[PDB]
Structures are given as structure tokens and as C-alpha cells.
Amino acid sequence: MAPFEKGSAKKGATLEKTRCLQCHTVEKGGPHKVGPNLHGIFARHSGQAEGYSYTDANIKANVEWTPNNMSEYLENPKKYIPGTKMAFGGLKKEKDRNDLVTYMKKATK
Ligand code: HEC
């Protein structure tokens, strides 16, 4: 894991498009896909998107989404919420996670 620090929103956007856009939307009103829509993610806890069928794992994990919570989850999702159906290896590079989270914090308003 690793302490969140501000990154490049611009590079965070490129990291979303190529690594997240396939399974998630982020724009308000965006449709769910394989993954929930992520708008307001930092306004709520895990498994709270109305309209999406979550695993018991994600729902009951009760995570309070925040920048360092997002960073540690994205390093290894399946280690953070065991049982999650999110097929994502993870992002090893602190810098890539700080770039992505910094973009998410702006686009999920
Ligand atoms: C499929 C190919 C996915 C990719 C690529 C990414 N995500 Fe995902 N994510 C996916 C699923 C199916 C789920 C639901 C998990 C479950 O166990 O039911 C998720 C969930 C998340 C969450 C939590 C959502 C919430 O609790 O409201 C987050 C924050 C999330 N995903 C973020 C995320 C990011 C940042 C990704 C790429 C950079 C990413 N996901 C890729 C499926 C898939």
C-alpha cells in the first residue's frame, strides 16, 4: 500500500479510459455495465449504487470511500474486498493510483 498524494488529473483520465471505462461509467446518470456507475463514489460506502446487483462481499464490506481507501483497494481489489467479482489485477505503482484517484475525485462530482 502507499500514502495518497495529489497526482495528474490528466494522466488519471488516460488511466480510466484504458483501464476502467470498459466496466464503469463515471458521468452522473451514466448507466451501469459489468461494474456500477461511479459517480458520487466518495459520497457513499461500498455496495450502495441503487440499480446494481453487488456481491455479498462488496455490499457488506462496509468501506468508507476516500482517496487512500480507493488507492489501497485499487492496488489489489480482491485482497481488499475478498469475494468481489471485479476482475482487476491491480495497479502496483503508487504514482498510477494517485493519478487515477485524483482524476476520479474531480469527475465523480
Ligand atoms: C471489469 C472488467 C472491471 C474493470 C476493468 C474494473 N472494474 Fe471496478 N468493479 C467491477 C465490478 C463487477 C464491480 C462490482 C464488485 C462486486 O464485488 O460486486 C466493481 C466495483 C468497483 C468499485 C466499488 C463500487 C462500489 O462499491 O460502489 C470501485 C470503486 C471500482 N470498481 C473501481 C474501479 C476502477 C478504478 C477500475 C479501473 C481503474 C475498475 N474498477 C476496473 C468490474 C470492473
Number of domains in the chain: 1
DSSP-derived 3-state class of residue 45: strand
Burial of residue 48 (number of CB atoms within 10 Å: 0-12, 13-18, 19+): middle
Q: Check pocket membership of 24 for ligand 1, CB cut-off 6 A.
A: yes
Asked whether the beta carbons of 32 and 41 are under 8 A apart, the reply is: no
Cα–Cα distances (Å) from 34 to 21, 43, 85, 92, in that order, read 10, 21, 10, 23
Closest residue to atom 34 of ligand 1, CA basis: 20
Resolution of this model in Å is: 2.4
For residue 30, which amino acid is it? G
Query: 91 is in which domain, residue-wise?
Result: 1-109
Pick from 4, 88, 99 the residue to mutate for probing ligand 1's pocket: most ligand atoms within 8 Å of its CB.
88
Angle subtended at Cα 21 by Cα 101 and Cα 107, rounded to the nearest 5 degrees: 45
Rg of the Cα trace of the chain? 13
DSSP string, 2-16: -------HHHHHHHH
Q: Measuring CA to CA, which residue among 70, 62, 14, 80 is closest to residue 41?
A: 70
- Cα–Cα distance between 73 and 81 in angstroms, integer? 8
Cell of 6: 495529489
Compute the residue count for the chain.
109
Q: How far is the CA of 73 from the centre of ligand 1 (A)?
A: 10
Q: Which technique was the structure solved with, according to the deposited record?
A: X-ray
Phi, psi of 99 (to 5 degrees): -65, -45
Who contacts 60 (Cβ-Cβ below 8 Å, separation ≥6)?
47
| DSSP H helix total and E strand total for the chain | 5, 0
Report which DSSP code applies to 29: T
